[PDB]
Amino acid sequence: MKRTFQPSVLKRNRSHGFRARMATKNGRQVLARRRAKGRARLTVSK
Amino acid sequence: VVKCKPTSPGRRHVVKVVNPELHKGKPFAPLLEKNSKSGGRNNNGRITTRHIGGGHKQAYRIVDFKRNKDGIPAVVERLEYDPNRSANIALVLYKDGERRYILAPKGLKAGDQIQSGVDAAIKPGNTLPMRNIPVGSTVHNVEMKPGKGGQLARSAGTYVQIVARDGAYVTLRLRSGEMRKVEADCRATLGEVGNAEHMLRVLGKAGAARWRGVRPTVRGTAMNPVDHPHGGGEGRNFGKHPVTPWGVQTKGKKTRSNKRTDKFIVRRRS
RNA sequence: AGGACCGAACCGACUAAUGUUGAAAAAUUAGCGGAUGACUUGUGGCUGGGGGUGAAAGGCCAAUCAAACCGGGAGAUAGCU
RNA sequence: GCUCGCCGGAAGACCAAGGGUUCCUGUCCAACGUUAAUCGGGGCAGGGUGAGUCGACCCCUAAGGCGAGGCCGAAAGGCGUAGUCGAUGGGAAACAGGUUAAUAUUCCUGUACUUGGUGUUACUGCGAAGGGGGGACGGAGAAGGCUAUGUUGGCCGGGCGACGGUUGUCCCGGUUUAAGCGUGUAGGCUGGUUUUCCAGGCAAAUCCGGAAAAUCAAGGCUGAGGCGUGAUGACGAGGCACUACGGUGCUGAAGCAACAAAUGCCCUGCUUCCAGGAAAAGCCUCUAAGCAUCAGGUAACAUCAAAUCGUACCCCAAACCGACACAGGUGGUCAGGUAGAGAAUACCAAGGCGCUUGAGAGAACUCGGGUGAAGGAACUAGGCAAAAUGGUGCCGUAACUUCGGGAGAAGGCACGCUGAUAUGUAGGUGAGGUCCCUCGCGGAUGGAGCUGAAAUCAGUCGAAGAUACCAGCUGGCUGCAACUGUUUAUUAAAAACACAGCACUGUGCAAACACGAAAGUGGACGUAUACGGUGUGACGCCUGCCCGGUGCCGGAAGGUUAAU
RNA sequence: AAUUCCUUGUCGGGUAAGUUCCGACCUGCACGAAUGGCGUAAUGAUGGCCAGGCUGUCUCCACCCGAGACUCAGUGAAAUUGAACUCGCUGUGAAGAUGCAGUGUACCCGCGGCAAGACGGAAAGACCCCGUGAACCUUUACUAUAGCUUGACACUGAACA
RNA sequence: CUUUAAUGUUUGAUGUUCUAACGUUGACCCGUAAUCCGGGUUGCGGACAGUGUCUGGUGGGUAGUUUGACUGGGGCGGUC
RNA sequence: AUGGUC
RNA sequence: GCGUCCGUAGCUCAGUUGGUUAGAGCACCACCUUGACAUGGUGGGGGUCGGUGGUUCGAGUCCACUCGGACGCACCA
Ligand SMILES: [Mg+2]
Ligand SMILES: [Mg+2]
Ligand SMILES: [Mg+2]
Ligand SMILES: [Mg+2]
Ligand SMILES: [Mg+2]
Ligand SMILES: [Mg+2]
Ligand SMILES: [Mg+2]
Ligand SMILES: [Mg+2]
Ligand SMILES: [Mg+2]
Ligand SMILES: [Mg+2]
Ligand SMILES: [Mg+2]
Ligand SMILES: [Mg+2]
Ligand SMILES: [Mg+2]
Ligand SMILES: [Mg+2]
Ligand SMILES: [Mg+2]
Ligand SMILES: [Mg+2]
Ligand SMILES: [Mg+2]
Ligand SMILES: [Mg+2]
Ligand SMILES: [Mg+2]
Ligand SMILES: [Mg+2]
Ligand SMILES: [Mg+2]
Ligand SMILES: [Mg+2]
Ligand SMILES: [Mg+2]
Ligand SMILES: [Mg+2]
Ligand SMILES: [Mg+2]
Ligand SMILES: [Mg+2]
Ligand SMILES: [Mg+2]
Ligand SMILES: [Mg+2]
Ligand SMILES: [Mg+2]
Ligand SMILES: [Mg+2]
Ligand SMILES: [Mg+2]
Ligand SMILES: [Mg+2]
Ligand SMILES: [Mg+2]
Ligand SMILES: [Mg+2]
Ligand SMILES: [Mg+2]
Ligand SMILES: [Mg+2]
Ligand SMILES: [Mg+2]
Ligand SMILES: [Mg+2]
Ligand SMILES: [Mg+2]
Ligand SMILES: [Mg+2]
Ligand SMILES: [Mg+2]
Ligand SMILES: [Mg+2]
Ligand SMILES: [Mg+2]
Ligand SMILES: [Mg+2]
Ligand SMILES: [Mg+2]
Ligand SMILES: [Mg+2]
Ligand SMILES: [Mg+2]
Ligand SMILES: [Mg+2]
Ligand SMILES: [Mg+2]
Ligand SMILES: [Mg+2]
Ligand SMILES: [Mg+2]
Ligand SMILES: [Mg+2]
Ligand SMILES: [Mg+2]
Ligand SMILES: [Mg+2]
Ligand SMILES: [Mg+2]
Ligand SMILES: [Mg+2]
Ligand SMILES: [Mg+2]
Ligand SMILES: [Mg+2]
Ligand SMILES: [Mg+2]
Ligand SMILES: [Mg+2]
Ligand SMILES: [Mg+2]
Ligand SMILES: [Mg+2]
Ligand SMILES: [Mg+2]
Ligand SMILES: [Mg+2]
Ligand SMILES: [Mg+2]
Ligand SMILES: [Mg+2]
Ligand SMILES: [Mg+2]
Ligand SMILES: [Mg+2]
Ligand SMILES: [Mg+2]
Ligand SMILES: [Mg+2]
Ligand SMILES: [Mg+2]
Ligand SMILES: [Mg+2]
Ligand SMILES: [Mg+2]
Ligand SMILES: [Mg+2]
Ligand SMILES: [Mg+2]
Ligand SMILES: [Mg+2]
Ligand SMILES: [Mg+2]
Ligand SMILES: [Mg+2]
Ligand SMILES: [Mg+2]
Ligand SMILES: [Mg+2]
Ligand SMILES: [Mg+2]
Ligand SMILES: [Mg+2]
Ligand SMILES: [Mg+2]
Ligand SMILES: [Mg+2]
Ligand SMILES: [Mg+2]
Ligand SMILES: [Mg+2]
Ligand SMILES: [Mg+2]
Ligand SMILES: [Mg+2]
Ligand SMILES: [Mg+2]
Ligand SMILES: [Mg+2]
Ligand SMILES: [Mg+2]
Ligand SMILES: [Mg+2]
Ligand SMILES: [Mg+2]
Structure with missing residues (x-):
């Protein structure tokens, strides 16, 4: 079939990337809710 | 202007409109630009006026709804199929090399010498403002504020008829059958608009919607x-x-409810 | 010339037999429909939960739909087992 | 190692996606592998990814994102001008041979080609933020000219056959050579050239634009492939000295001709259709600003550049998406034979695999299949399933009709091989031979040679000649819907929805109307022959009565009447 | 008739026979004119019916070749399950018995099958009821709202008549 | 006081000419390489229109809830 | 405006 | 099978309009007209307003139920 995950790096870095988390002020709180619980995979940039 | 011969279901009902006066070639190059298909969605990205989307690549043709150049005569050159509006568009060469696009009147061909301005002689093709036109002669490209551009009566085969010249106002009758006051010095153009049988065109099938950009x-x-x-x-x-x-x-x-314009509406369309 | 015909790629999924802790949480084998058009397809961008999109079946929106997914009020309230 | 089998438009040969040592070389079999296991895509360790030319950045953009100021929202913020990014598209350059256990257009071999400055000698007009030309652009269609490509000849070398025959019109291989560089053919486009003047291109223009006169009759562009050079080089039958069964070094004949032919190329060209087919830059031209001969551009030589980054490997699967080493899915590139209309189909070569459990016996029963005496739908809700028809050519073909259709209506007739017509014809191609010559890649007369249908007539084998594989069951009355389409991914594809057409009605433009508290945007750079809403659903014949309820439209003298 | 209940209405073809089909009648329970009437060439993976061709669909099933199922070798699951030394009957009885009461047959234990029972086993039933339980939906149910428009006041000015 | 109508005024309505408040999704010049915006020059409209406050009407566009029990099982009848 | 039937 | 309009002359009628008192069209013909039939007229009977009660002297009439026809049915698989 045509399954759910169809992978693309140039879409993933623009959707769930760090510079995607950049401009949205409601996303700065998301980064500040991952740093302040201390995860290793902060965002899915590589 | 013939029915297409019934070879197969799909051309059983087609009436074309064909015209051999046109230009079988490429448009004039420095007059195009880009008119991309907006797809019926605004900056918020939502469908606001429905049914639109699809079709063919419509390259805009610039066209002069102002006709500002007084005095200088202007020979016509050829006619072309501007795919934006349902009229046809003449290509005009002025006496000093400037080419333009204008709307095509009913009696137009290749060889006419039109002239724009105040002191134009009265013949179809010419334009002149409405305190020198004589009463009764039907005009197109009527402007509602002097110098804006041709706004009233600009479709395939329409016209408006000047009925009264009193004071510093003129009174028209628009194509939808409503009378209307206009400032006595707006820039109108004599004679009708050429391609008068667009309403005879039956499209024939479903495909002539979605080659024109109308969805279900x-x-x-x-x-x-x-x-x-x-x-x-x-x-x-x-x-x-x-x-x-x-x-x-x-x-x-x-x-x-646009109550700031009711000074000018003399009688409603019935 | 064709929203033309017979027909492989390609797209779709009408009937029957397999199989329903199977090779697959929707497929396989023999047959089927369209197949220069209102088509099919790779890339990118746009729309957003009472809102999006709909050639209209309440369909579909991350294997979830007559109101999605996650966290919070919330240890919601329960004459009922 | 050698018998057998399977795909050969795939399960063969590669890349962009995505994964991230899965790649090669030693060593190990405890878990992993659906079995055994010395083997591995498994465990450990070591090696392996070489660029001026090929891909990313890079100059310029499309959708669209952000957006100094700016406008508008309670703050968050929402849009949006100047600008700034965004590949999926435009922009300079390299082809062949050889080597590694595992990389090559990247290293080596002869040969290239472009883009930058700098420095010389010669002549003088250069300029960017604007101007102009150009980049620059659909769908369908037929021909013509070719090529990759294949076949039979020409030649070179080897073979005389495990049993009948095989010194020959006999058997097998081999016949390959690129980029670049002068030439301007098939074929396509445009008439050139000299001069006066102009309100136009945001100011100037000596190029584009537009009036005007003199002439000159072909000037310029475009461009597939052979043709000359590249190239006395490389490759190549091999004979073959070592020789571990690892391979190594010298050597090395032919290297021509015809015929056929693409979906590739001339082709960004031609014809024609209505639904009328992008941008800015690189590339050229043009000027007033100004530098007044220092800069600055244009020719041969010489110099060095040309940095960084990514290149292994799988990439229709065992490495990606699907929890499985999953009968699932995923976009592009190449296209051999004998039949064949053909990328269908049947067997094949180049190439790859026998799909990680087996050895047996020959029960009921079940899955997948081949055959069948008499009858031939009595089966059942129902011809469900199965069987059957099935191609090319010719004669022929009903009611009904919107003149097209119905129609491949229905039914029939010939078909294998051999010989002759013709020792291979009609046709296609085309070498010599000769003539002028406006000259070159010539133009004609010319017919060698090659290739090769289709038909008629005799003759012959079988039970049967479209023999296998592919390859329509036909006809008779109705109900619904005009039709082609589309949806309930994952139990309903239908009579449901759509549609061309008709009709009401709203809207004169800062439109109605929708997403938005608001700026603004769609509507459209559209203007009533246009747009939105509702309802019916081609076309033919038609669309009648009822304004009392209930909507809606028009009236404003009268009674009831808010805030104030 | 896709609408017709009394109904298989009534007649005629089709069949030996025809509750469906095609053609007429009208006593239409309750068609009907743009939520459209009737009609129609072509078309439909469409609804209904008869005919020729064709045969395992069938009367009536027989044989054959292959992948399983049976045996031996290696790897090796899952649903369930209070416990178990787990027979038939007539009767009793949460009222439809392997056990209770009476009676009669039966040496203990495996593989190959058939599927009647153990109210067999996955789903705290969807059907109706109960819930002063909720979601969506409709309206002349109630109560308020966005939007629409009505006048007063401000931004709001002078003369005028 | 029945109840008029002439000098002056006390205050809201009905209409018209003007413009300085506001309007301009009308042209021209500047910031400017700029159609957004802002500055003035003008033309047209103008005491309207547009907007804030209260009030009348309309308002399933949108929202929260209600709709009883008895009953030889419920709805329908009765009954309270 | 009155004037059907035999 | 809430409840309604309701229930009458040889045929449909009106009359409950919060109560008392009897109203028609059509039409059976004897007679007035026309040569002759009606189109016109006098006329006589024809309603305890289905039935049983009560408020009531005065009710066809203000009503609770019974037979008959139309006017609304939802729930239920
Ligand atoms: Mg529309
Ligand atoms: Mg589909
Ligand atoms: Mg289906
Ligand atoms: Mg299939
Ligand atoms: Mg087809
Ligand atoms: Mg087709
Ligand atoms: Mg929600
Ligand atoms: Mg529906
Ligand atoms: Mg889903
Ligand atoms: Mg909800
Ligand atoms: Mg709480
Ligand atoms: Mg709880
Ligand atoms: Mg609680
Ligand atoms: Mg094979
Ligand atoms: Mg094939
Ligand atoms: Mg490994
Ligand atoms: Mg190894
Ligand atoms: Mg193992
Ligand atoms: Mg082992
Ligand atoms: Mg390996
Ligand atoms: Mg390994
Ligand atoms: Mg190098
Ligand atoms: Mg490159
Ligand atoms: Mg953009
Ligand atoms: Mg912005
Ligand atoms: Mg800002
Ligand atoms: Mg850029
Ligand atoms: Mg790209
Ligand atoms: Mg690219
Ligand atoms: Mg330029
Ligand atoms: Mg083309
Ligand atoms: Mg060749
Ligand atoms: Mg070749
Ligand atoms: Mg031999
Ligand atoms: Mg022999
Ligand atoms: Mg040979
Ligand atoms: Mg070359
Ligand atoms: Mg490599
Ligand atoms: Mg390799
Ligand atoms: Mg592959
Ligand atoms: Mg796979
Ligand atoms: Mg799975
Ligand atoms: Mg395997
Ligand atoms: Mg296997
Ligand atoms: Mg076996
Ligand atoms: Mg057997
Ligand atoms: Mg058989
Ligand atoms: Mg038989
Ligand atoms: Mg036989
Ligand atoms: Mg039968
Ligand atoms: Mg069948
Ligand atoms: Mg068959
Ligand atoms: Mg249909
Ligand atoms: Mg679709
Ligand atoms: Mg389905
Ligand atoms: Mg529709
Ligand atoms: Mg429509
Ligand atoms: Mg707009
Ligand atoms: Mg319809
Ligand atoms: Mg209809
Ligand atoms: Mg009507
Ligand atoms: Mg009325
Ligand atoms: Mg009314
Ligand atoms: Mg009104
Ligand atoms: Mg029927
Ligand atoms: Mg009916
Ligand atoms: Mg019936
Ligand atoms: Mg009968
Ligand atoms: Mg009938
Ligand atoms: Mg109907
Ligand atoms: Mg209905
Ligand atoms: Mg109805
Ligand atoms: Mg109607
Ligand atoms: Mg169809
Ligand atoms: Mg029968
Ligand atoms: Mg098997
Ligand atoms: Mg077994
Ligand atoms: Mg075993
Ligand atoms: Mg026991
Ligand atoms: Mg018992
Ligand atoms: Mg028992
Ligand atoms: Mg059982
Ligand atoms: Mg069993
Ligand atoms: Mg049971
Ligand atoms: Mg049970
Ligand atoms: Mg329960
Ligand atoms: Mg609603
Ligand atoms: Mg509601
Ligand atoms: Mg109850
Ligand atoms: Mg009951
Ligand atoms: Mg009385
Ligand atoms: Mg009489
Ligand atoms: Mg039912």
């Missing part, structure tokens, strides 16, 4: 009642007064 239209009593008032029924039922999607009555209810 689902009538009201198809839907389920969260999408339109007319829905429901275990079968067919239309037991409610006929409405829009958004609540309002549609079979007659007037919707004009």
